[PDB]
């Protein structure tokens, strides 16, 4: 059994915007967690629906690693029960989540002077997302009865707004990278162990 190099999942050239939360399938390998806390430098390391390290050397079903960059103030939004913007229309964990949530300040890399406006977030949506749903659409959010004919206007706004990350910003508006580790568990066979 070969070690699951979360390296690719955690350390990376670039991270995707929350509206495009990237998912990688951990499988056919072995992966510890004590080591992860050992990796340290993690602002938030909260695993839900499992004991702290009772899984350290245990096996589970397909493990999915979702990665995105959000604001520190929105880090709370990434948890069962939340009702914020990021949770409702960008990424939504279930009320019975059985995985992990890891997050670290990325101000040194994902921010630049002049503003790193590359990262984006969905501001408006016609209905709340569903658990682990995604929505890479780029369509005007028709607020009222009058059609929008694909042009911005009164009660006709765009649904993907930019993120202004600058080093001078405060922690609350600072870029934090996030990696959620999905640990579905059932009698089904396993490939991820520790």
């Amino acid at each position: 059994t070969n070690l699951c190099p979360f390296g690719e999942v955690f350390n990376a050239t670039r991270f995707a915007s929350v509206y495009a939360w990237n998912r990688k399938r951990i499988s056919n390998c072995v992966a510890d967690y004590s080591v992860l806390y050992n990796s340290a430098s993690f602002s938030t390391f909260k695993c839900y629906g499992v004991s702290p390290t009772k899984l350290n050397d245990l096996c589970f079903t397909n493990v999915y690693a979702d990665s995105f960059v959000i604001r520190g103030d929105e880090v709370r939004q990434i948890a069962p029960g939340q009702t914020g913007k990021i949770a409702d229309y960008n990424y939504k964990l279930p009320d019975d989540f059985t995985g992990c949530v890891i997050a670290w300040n990325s101000n040194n890399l994902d921010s630049k002077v002049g503003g790193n406006y590359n990262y984006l977030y969905r501001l408006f949506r016609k209905s709340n997302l569903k658990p682990f749903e995604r929505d890479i659409s780029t369509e005007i959010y028709q607020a009222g009865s009058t059609p929008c004919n694909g042009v911005e206007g009164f009660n006709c706004y765009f649904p993907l707004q930019s993120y202004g990350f600058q080093p001078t910003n405060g922690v609350g508006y600072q870029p934090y990278r996030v990696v959620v580790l999905s640990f579905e568990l059932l009698h089904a066979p396993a490939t991820v162990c520790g």
């Binding site: 202004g164 001078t168 910003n169 922690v171 508006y173």
Partner: protein, 592 residues
């Protein structure tokens, strides 16, 4: 969907874009203030133009939503605020007209330079020199010359400009559903949607006057004291039972009687606490000043500064590396970037000033959770008042002993307390009447009650009746002395200082009463009173989300302005003045 749902969508957009734009503008300006380069100037202008355009269009769009159909007041208030274009309603020709007139008045005020009545080489500018003269000179002749020069050359020019400015400004107000430009200004205090909390606009006039009456006795006795001592310096011109000549008030406009302390210093031998030398001896630095301030606010319960604050704020002159504006300024760039710009120096003055400005910072740090439109002080006077209360609590000899800038067994003597209270009274109690006078004149002028033919006439009449000041030389209607004040030629409101002053003492009294402090309010330190910090925060977090009356009630326990706190703060000085005036006259013959 309901118009309200549509509104929420609109606002939730505006904020999510306006905030970013305001941050861009703020950061570019920080560059042009922390650095002064033609480039930075142009960059600042581009960013300002984009912010302008945003607010302009978003205002028009907000008007299409109808406030009446909005029910949640919070949403209603945000929308209301955004629905105040102003200039737009006027034909763009008239918009340019008013812009050009205001720019011309501003340029006259800035470029204005008055020359000697004799020496052709003594032509000096308004602020660079004439101010200094009128603030630290003791010659009737010289001061009269400077006074007449400013209100003649600079004033007479502005007279026609202001005559048209009132017309265009009132036109704007009426086109924005306001009876006069005065009502438009007074609506800054307007608030609604509660049981009684709601304040109307004219009720501001009512309240300002019913408070000024209660302050009048104090100003009369202070007037008598000042009149007598000034008489003993300029005995050739000061009647013992009449008004005082304006050119003798310590500033070009007689708005602050602070420079009269050496001429009106009770006692005079006794010294005043000046920890400046003590700080220099304790090798304090700019950081240490601001760190002590942080510690203070920590004690009362508020958070400490953001790491970004210390990391990006400019607290010391930029060596000679850069050219910079020095006027102390607090900064809410949005997005959690809080900063302070001050050419801090190791003096008691800068220490107290830093407390004030960091108090502004804390207010801003306390209403960030609110939406952009609701992220501001409760009214136009709440911000300045909180900063002041911080400085007023740091000046107390107690906090000076605590930080270790004052000996451990130092004790105040009644003579020193009275010196300090008198200095305070000049700066505070002296401007109050002048402030009321100026703003009442402008309100009535915009309303139309004062015709131009009696436009300067009533002005000086009012001075005599209210401020108790008289014209050294008769000024016909060709003059326009009112515009000689920056806040006037530059279209600013002037009532904020009256309100700020009244409020700050109400706040301070509440906060002390919560710290169980006992004794003269002038000797109160909220330090280490977690309860005081909690009450203050429970107001500060509100921003302008809740009615200004409600914020006040949360902290002082009333729904309107009261002067009893101020009178209590100055009561010792009041009584001392009463006795010192027993053998003189308290009052002033209007006509003289």
């Amino acid at each position: 969907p309901s118009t309200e749902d549509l509104v929420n969508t609109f606002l939730e957009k505006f904020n999510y874009e306006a905030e970013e734009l305001s941050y861009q503008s703020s950061l570019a300006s920080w560059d042009y203030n922390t650095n002064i380069s033609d480039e930075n100037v142009q960059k600042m202008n581009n960013a300002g133009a984009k912010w302008s355009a945003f607010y302009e269009e978003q205002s028009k769009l907000a008007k299409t939503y109808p406030l009446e159909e909005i029910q949640d007041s919070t949403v209603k208030r945000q929308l209301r605020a955004l629905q105040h274009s102003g200039s737009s309603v006027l034909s763009a020709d008239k918009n340019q007209r008013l812009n050009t007139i205001l720019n011309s008045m501003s340029t006259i005020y800035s470029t204005g330079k008055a020359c000697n009545p004799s020496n052709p080489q003594e032509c000096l500018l308004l602020e660079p020199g004439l101010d200094d003269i009128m603030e630290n000179s003791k010659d009737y002749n010289e001061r009269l010359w400077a006074w007449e020069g400013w209100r003649s050359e600079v004033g007479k020019q502005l007279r026609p400009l202001y005559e048209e400015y009132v017309a265009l400004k009132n036109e704007m107000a009426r086109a924005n559903n306001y009876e006069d430009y005065g009502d438009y200004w007074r609506g800054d205090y307007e608030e609604e949607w509660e049981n009684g909390y709601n304040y109307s606009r004219n009720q501001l006039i009512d309240d300002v006057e019913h408070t000024f009456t209660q302050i009048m006795p104090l100003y009369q006795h202070l007037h008598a004291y000042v009149r007598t001592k000034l008489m003993d310096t300029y005995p050739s011109y000061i009647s013992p039972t009449g008004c005082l000549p304006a050119h003798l008030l310590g500033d070009m406009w007689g708005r602050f009687w602070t420079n009269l302390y050496p001429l009106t210093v009770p006692f005079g031998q006794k010294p005043n606490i000046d920890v400046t030398n003590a700080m220099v001896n304790q090798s304090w630095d700019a950081r240490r000043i601001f760190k002590e301030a942080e510690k203070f606010f920590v004690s009362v319960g508020l958070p400490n500064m953001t790491q970004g604050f210390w990391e990006n704020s400019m607290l010391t002159e930029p060596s000679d590396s850069r050219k910079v504006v020095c006027h102390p300024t607090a900064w809410d760039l949005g997005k959690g970037d809080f900063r302070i710009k001050m050419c801090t120096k190791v003096t008691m003055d800068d220490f107290l000033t830093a407390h004030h400005e960091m108090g502004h910072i804390q207010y801003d740090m306390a209403y960030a959770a609110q939406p952009f439109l609701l992220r501001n002080g409760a009214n136009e006077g709440f911000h300045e008042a909180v900063g002041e209360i911080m400085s007023l609590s740091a000046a107390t000899p107690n906090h000076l002993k605590n930080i270790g800038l004052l000996p451990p067994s130092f004790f105040e003597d009644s003579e020193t307390e009275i010196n300090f209270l008198l200095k305070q009274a000049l700066t505070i109690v002296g401007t109050l009447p002048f402030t009321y006078m100026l703003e009442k004149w402008r309100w009535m002028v915009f309303k139309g009650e004062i015709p131009k033919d009696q436009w300067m006439k009533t002005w000086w009449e009012m001075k005599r009746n209210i401020v108790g000041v008289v014209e050294p030389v008769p000024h016909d209607e060709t003059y326009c002395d009112p515009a000689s004040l920056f806040h006037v030629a530059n279209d600013y409101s002037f009532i904020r200082y009256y309100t700020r002053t009244i409020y700050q003492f109400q706040f301070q009294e509440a906060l002390c009463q919560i710290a169980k402090h006992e004794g003269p309010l002038h000797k109160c330190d909220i330090s280490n009173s977690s309860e005081a910090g909690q009450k203050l925060l429970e107001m500060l977090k509100l921003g302008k989300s809740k009615p200004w009356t409600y914020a006040l009630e949360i902290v002082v326990g009333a729904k309107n302005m009261d002067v009893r706190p101020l009178l209590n703060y100055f009561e010792p000085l009041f009584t001392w003045l009463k006795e010192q005036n027993r053998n003189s006259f308290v009052g002033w013959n209007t006509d003289w």
